[PDB]
Design a protein around this ligand. Structure first.
Ligand SMILES: [Fe+2]
Ligand SMILES: [O-]
Ligand SMILES: [Zn+2]
Length: 349
């Protein structure tokens, strides 16, 4: 059978319109949406105070729709998985850097992670690339002086994700800005006619971090947004798809993929092991990661016996299924790190 997955570019706080168009797809076609995938710019502002962390020009300092769903006045009709972009309540996403539900049916994948759903493995890479911030650590708790840098993709996510395709393939990978160089792998002459400003950047357009991750993992699909235009390219065996912003018709597309199994949203096994084995580099809650450690060196200590022990302890303390937690985000930050520390220390290394 077939599972219909909705892929969305930039939301920019227009959730009610997005879910309205998603419902018009289900009724005008008769097909059922399994779940929704968004490439970023979610602007998950809980209340007015969160506007400080929204890095936008003054004209875009707006609350958007998310607070209606956070308050429960609105309910997301589909399970929505998303990454962070450059227009975010960056304090919220920092609290949930290990992933988490921002409200019912809206799951943030964290700074980066892999999840499981309907037999698929989905990798997310949050943020946009700025070379001067790719080596900065994260400062916690969030400070209003970090609004300009919290949403910049850090280089270390490359080492966190590089081994994820060893056991099985990655079906879908998500980034906000494009993988660098992918613009030349499609009909770029046509793209330059509708987007003349893109031609001056040439092949250096996208993110070099997402370029490396794409070449390493080679997923079936790589989805991106940010650029407010539609685009499609082929990099070896990877189908690249770019989407626009909500409000225009190039914002939503649909992947019709085979459905072997219908399963609830679950943590990815290989990601959980990476998450536990890199705990020493994240043990300082005020500044992480501590790059005096080598993430590849920490991950080289993975064995099949330790991986099995890690999953046994993860299922005990957290559970394999990703379930909704309505605790405040600062509590979910401390809770998830508490159990990562507990599982690691029980391995005795
Ligand atoms: Fe963006
Ligand atoms: O954007
Ligand atoms: Zn955008």
């Amino acid at each position: 059978q077939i599972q219909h997955i909705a892929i969305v570019g930039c939301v920019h706080g227009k959730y009610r319109e997005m879910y309205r168009q998603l419902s018009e797809y289900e009724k005008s076609t008769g097909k059922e949406i399994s779940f929704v995938i968004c490439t970023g710019d979610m602007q998950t502002l809980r209340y007015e105070a969160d506007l400080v962390y929204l890095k936008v020009p003054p004209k875009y300092k707006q609350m958007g729709d998310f607070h209606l769903y956070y308050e429960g006045k609105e309910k997301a009709p589909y399970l929505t998985l998303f990454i962070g972009g450059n227009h975010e309540s960056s304090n919220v996403l920092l609290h949930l850097y290990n992933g988490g539900f921002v409200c019912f049916n809206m799951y943030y994948l964290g700074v980066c992670s892999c999840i499981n759903i309907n037999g698929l493995r989905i990798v997310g890479v949050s943020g946009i690339y700025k070379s001067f911030d790719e080596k900065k650590p994260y400062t916690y708790p969030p400070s209003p002086n970090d609004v300009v840098s919290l949403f910049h993709t850090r280089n270390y996510v490359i080492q966190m994700l590089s081994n994820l395709s060893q056991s099985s393939q990655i079906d879908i990978s998500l980034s906000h800005d494009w993988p660098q160089g992918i613009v030349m792998k499609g009909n770029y002459k046509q793209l330059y006619r509708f987007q003349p400003g893109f031609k001056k950047d040439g092949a250096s357009l996208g993110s070099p971090i997402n370029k490396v991750i794409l070449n390493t993992l080679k997923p079936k699909y790589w989805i991106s947004g940010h650029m407010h235009c539609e685009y499609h390219a082929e990099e070896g065996p990877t189908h690249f798809i770019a989407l626009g912003k909500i409000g225009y018709k190039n914002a939503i597309s649909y992947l019709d993929l085979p459905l072997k199994q219908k399963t609830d949203l679950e943590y990815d096994k290989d990601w959980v092991c990476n998450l536990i084995m890199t705990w020493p580099a994240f043990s300082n809650k005020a500044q992480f990661p501590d790059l005096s450690y080598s993430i590849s060196e920490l991950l080289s200590k993975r064995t099949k016996e330790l991986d099995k022990k890690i999953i046994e302890l993860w299922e005990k303390y957290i559970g394999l299924k990703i379930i909704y937690d309505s605790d405040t985000f600062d509590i979910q930050f401390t809770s998830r790190r508490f159990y990562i520390e507990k599982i690691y220390n029980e391995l005795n290394i």
